[PDB]
Every structure is written in structure tokens, then in C-alpha cells.
Design an enzyme around this catalytic site. Structure first.
Site, short mmCIF file in Angstrom:
data_model
loop_
_atom_site.label_atom_id
_atom_site.label_comp_id
_atom_site.label_asym_id
_atom_site.label_seq_id
_atom_site.Cartn_x
_atom_site.Cartn_y
_atom_site.Cartn_z
N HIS A 264 0.78 -1.12 -0.09
CA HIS A 264 0.00 -0.04 -0.03
C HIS A 264 0.58 1.33 0.03
O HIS A 264 0.38 2.28 -0.51
CB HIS A 264 -1.17 0.03 0.94
CG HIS A 264 -0.71 0.48 2.30
ND1 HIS A 264 -0.35 -0.47 3.31
CD2 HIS A 264 -0.46 1.49 3.15
CE1 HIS A 264 0.01 -0.06 4.51
NE2 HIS A 264 -0.09 1.23 4.36
N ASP B 48 0.00 -7.50 1.52
CA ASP B 48 0.44 -6.17 1.75
C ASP B 48 2.04 -6.26 1.71
O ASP B 48 2.46 -5.88 2.65
CB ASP B 48 -0.22 -5.50 2.75
CG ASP B 48 -0.10 -3.97 2.53
OD1 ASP B 48 0.46 -3.59 1.58
OD2 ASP B 48 -0.32 -3.35 3.70
N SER C 173 3.47 2.63 8.08
CA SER C 173 3.32 1.62 7.28
C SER C 173 4.59 1.08 6.48
O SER C 173 5.43 1.98 6.33
CB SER C 173 2.41 2.53 6.01
OG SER C 173 1.21 2.76 6.61
N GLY C 174 4.62 -0.17 6.37
CA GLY C 174 5.91 -0.74 5.58
C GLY C 174 7.07 -1.06 6.46
O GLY C 174 8.04 -1.60 5.98
C1 LIG Z 1 -9.96 -2.25 8.14
O1 LIG Z 1 -9.27 -1.03 8.30
C2 LIG Z 1 -8.62 -0.44 7.49
O2 LIG Z 1 -9.10 -0.81 6.28
N1 LIG Z 1 -7.51 0.09 7.92
C3 LIG Z 1 -6.63 0.90 7.17
N2 LIG Z 1 -5.53 1.19 7.63
C4 LIG Z 1 -4.81 1.72 6.51
N3 LIG Z 1 -5.62 1.47 5.49
N4 LIG Z 1 -6.60 0.91 5.69
C5 LIG Z 1 -5.04 1.95 4.12
C6 LIG Z 1 -4.84 0.66 3.58
C7 LIG Z 1 -5.22 -0.09 2.48
C8 LIG Z 1 -4.88 -1.51 2.23
C9 LIG Z 1 -3.86 -2.27 2.89
C10 LIG Z 1 -3.71 -3.50 2.53
N5 LIG Z 1 -3.54 -4.72 2.17
C11 LIG Z 1 -3.26 -1.85 4.03
C12 LIG Z 1 -3.74 -0.33 4.26
C13 LIG Z 1 -3.84 2.85 4.12
C14 LIG Z 1 -3.45 3.29 2.84
N6 LIG Z 1 -2.92 3.62 1.84
C15 LIG Z 1 -3.38 3.34 5.44
C16 LIG Z 1 -1.87 3.80 5.35
N7 LIG Z 1 -3.53 2.28 6.48
C17 LIG Z 1 -3.02 2.78 7.95
C18 LIG Z 1 -3.23 3.46 8.92
C19 LIG Z 1 -2.48 3.61 9.88
C20 LIG Z 1 -1.38 2.88 10.13
C21 LIG Z 1 -1.28 1.94 9.30
C22 LIG Z 1 0.08 0.68 9.47
F1 LIG Z 1 0.51 0.29 8.18
F2 LIG Z 1 0.94 1.38 9.93
F3 LIG Z 1 -0.33 -0.01 10.14
C23 LIG Z 1 -1.79 1.88 8.02
#
Ligand SMILES: COC(=O)/N=c1/nc2n([nH]1)[C@H](c1ccc(C#N)cc1)C(C#N)=C(C)N2c1cccc(C(F)(F)F)c1
Ligand SMILES: *[C@@H]1O[C@H](CO[C@@H]2O[C@@H](C)[C@@H](O)[C@@H](O)[C@@H]2O)[C@@H](O[C@@H]2O[C@H](CO)[C@@H](O)[C@H](O)[C@H]2NC(C)=O)[C@H](O)[C@H]1NC(C)=O
Ligand SMILES: *[C@@H]1O[C@H](CO[C@@H]2O[C@@H](C)[C@@H](O)[C@@H](O)[C@@H]2O)[C@@H](O)[C@H](O)[C@H]1NC(C)=O
Length: 216
Positions: free
Chosen positions: A41, A88, A171-172
Site C-alpha cells: 500500500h 500487503d 506503514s511498511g
Molecule cells: C479495516 O481497516 C482498514 O482498512 N484500515 C486501514 N488502515 C490503513 N488503510 N486501511 C489503508 C490500507 C489499505 C490497504 C491495505 C492492504 N493490504 C493496507 C492499508 C492505508 C493506505 N493507503 C493506510 C496507510 N492504513 C494505515 C493507517 C495507519 C497505520 C497503518 C500501518 F500500516 F502502519 F499499520 C496503515
């Protein structure tokens, strides 16, 4: 990282900052001198020809001669499925090979298929939001593997007894459990650091044979 602490400088020399124009947008892990791994992502919808791969960093706000900067030559994906939040993971091949030293080291990965039991203690880390804005100094956080309110397609973690967890910009980034990279930060539910939903990481151990095929 919400509710974490500063890492010791260069404590995690496999830790990578992915940057644009410059500014951190995602973590990554050095898995060979010429490859990093990150969340799919992080780079969907990004022009990868613009991404800088910053190794050896600690304090992003400062000039750091320990840093080495690469560009992305090519990307290897593995069925990234954003709708189901699956697979992911991406491997980014660099335009050259890192110089391995005290500040830049290749991470160690688990055995193919190795599962983590409820209660495993790990460290999450990254330069993501603190609760504020993005961290300057790399942050780390003690987290605990939970299998409840988590699919077998993820490694999930939770901090009990207070609200703390990964957040945007983490993320990542790697999740290190028993000295091994067992996760890549993937998604949160309930907003960051809800104190209810575990944080979800791509399960690196499922992908080890694929990773090995790419990096050698
Ligand atoms: C069901 O709940 C849910 O869908 N939550 C999400 N959270 C997402 N997303 N979705 C989005 C997402 C969308 C798809 C995938 C996959 N596979 C992973 C994350 C997103 C983007 N672009 C971020 C940064 N993030 C996100 C927000 C905060 C922290 C993180 C981390 F990667 F650090 F965990 C990721
Ligand atoms: C908080 O986390 C630290 C560090 O976690 C360990 O090392 C990481 C790299 C990763 O491998 C994790 O799975 C590990 O748990 C813990 O620090 C260990 O603490 C013990 C005390 O039992 C000590 O003997 C070790 O030397 C420490 N390891 C390192 C590398 O520093 C710490 O225990 C955790 N604290 C809590 C309360 O969970
Ligand atoms: C590898 O790339 C290094 C950094 O590249 C820089 O960032 C990319 C995204 C582009 O903006 C590019 O024009 C920048 O130079 C280089 O400094 C380095 O020379 C390269 N190493 C090689 C080719 O072995």
C-alpha cells in the site's frame, strides 16, 4: 508510533525510510544489500521513480553522514489485494547495493511458515505519527502478538493497559519478534492506538520462500 519511545541511535540498522521530495512517507526493511521490503500500500499510487530509499537514518530532521540513499530500479509484488487487505508486501530492488556497516545491516527473516503464538513479545518501530505529526527520531514500541480480532493472513499485535500502536507513516515498517522480521506494518482499525483493535502486519513468514526467490 503512538505511545512509544526514541530508539537508541542506529539500534535497528535494517530500518529504512522511504521518502518523496525529501519527506518520509513509509518505512521499509533492508533484506539484502540491493533489496528492501515494504508494504504494497506504500507504493500503490506512488511514482516509484521518485522514491528515495534512505538507509542508516535516525533523526530525519538532521543532516546525517551515516545515511545512504538509493533509488528504486524495480518492484516485485505478490498478489496485493487492497480490498481484502491481503498480501500487503512489496520488494523494491535498489539501483545499487548498500555498504553494510554499523549503521546499515541486512535483517534476519523467520523460517517459511513460522507462526507466532499469542503472547509473543515484539518491537514495532517507525517514523510515523506520534499521535504530534511525524517523528523526527525513530520510535520503537513494545507490543504483544494477539490471535484474537486477527485473521491467519496477518500477524496482529496489541498493547494492553493503555492506548499505543503504529500509525500513519509507520506503514511498511518491520515488526521484530525474537530478533527476526515477522511483520510489515499494514493496517489499523478504530483509528491509531484504539486500545481495542490489534494492529495488523503482513505475515512475513508466509512470504519467505517468495522473498528468497527474489533476493537469492
Ligand atoms: C479495516 O481497516 C482498514 O482498512 N484500515 C486501514 N488502515 C490503513 N488503510 N486501511 C489503508 C490500507 C489499505 C490497504 C491495505 C492492504 N493490504 C493496507 C492499508 C492505508 C493506505 N493507503 C493506510 C496507510 N492504513 C494505515 C493507517 C495507519 C497505520 C497503518 C500501518 F500500516 F502502519 F499499520 C496503515
Ligand atoms: C520490551 O522489548 C524489549 C526488546 O524486545 C526484544 O528484542 C527485540 C529486538 C525483539 O527481538 C523482541 O521479540 C524481544 O522481546 C525487551 O528487551 C529484552 O528484555 C529482556 C528482559 O526479559 C532482556 O534479557 C533482553 O536482553 C532484552 N532484549 C533486548 C534485545 O533488548 C523487553 O523485555 C520488553 N519489555 C517488556 C515489558 O515487554
Ligand atoms: C542510485 O540513486 C541515488 C539517488 O538517486 C536520487 O533519487 C532518485 C529517486 C532520483 O531523484 C535521482 O535522480 C537522484 O539522484 C544516486 O545518488 C546514485 O548515484 C545511484 N547509484 C547508482 C546508480 O549506483
Amino acid at each position: 508510533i503512538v505511545g512509544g519511545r526514541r530508539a537508541r541511535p542506529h539500534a535497528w540498522p535494517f530500518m529504512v525510510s522511504l521518502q518523496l521530495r525529501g519527506g518520509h512517507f513509509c518505512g521499509a526493511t533492508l533484506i539484502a544489500p540491493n533489496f528492501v521490503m515494504s508494504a504494497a500500500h506504500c507504493v500503490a499510487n506512488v511514482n516509484v521513480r521518485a522514491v528515495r530509499v534512505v538507509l542508516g537514518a535516525h533523526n530525519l530532521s538532521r543532516r546525517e553522514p551515516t545515511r545512504q540513499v538509493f533509488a528504486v530500479q524495480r518492484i516485485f509484488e505478490n498478489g496485493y489485494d487492497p480490498v481484502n487487505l491481503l498480501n500487503d508486501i512489496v520488494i523494491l530492488q535498489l539501483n545499487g547495493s548498500a555498504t553494510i556497516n554499523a549503521n546499515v545491516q541486512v535483517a534476519q527473516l523467520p523460517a517459511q511458515g513460522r507462526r507466532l503464538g499469542n503472547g509473543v513479545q515484539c518491537l514495532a518501530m517507525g517514523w510515523g505519527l506520534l499521535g504530534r505529526g511525524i517523528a523526527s527520531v525513530l520510535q520503537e514500541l513494545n507490543v504483544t502478538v494477539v490471535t484474537s480480532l486477527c485473521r491467519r493472513s496477518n500477524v496482529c499485535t496489541l498493547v494492553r493497559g493503555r492506548q499505543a500502536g503504529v500509525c500513519f507513516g509507520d506503514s511498511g515498517s518491520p515488526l521484530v519478534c525474537n530478533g527476526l522480521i515477522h511483520g510489515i506494518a499494514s493496517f489499523v482499525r478504530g483509528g491509531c492506538a484504539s486500545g481495542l483493535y490489534p494492529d495488523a502486519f503482513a505475515p512475513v513468514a508466509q512470504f519467505v520462500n517468495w522473498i528468497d526467490s527474489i533476493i537469492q
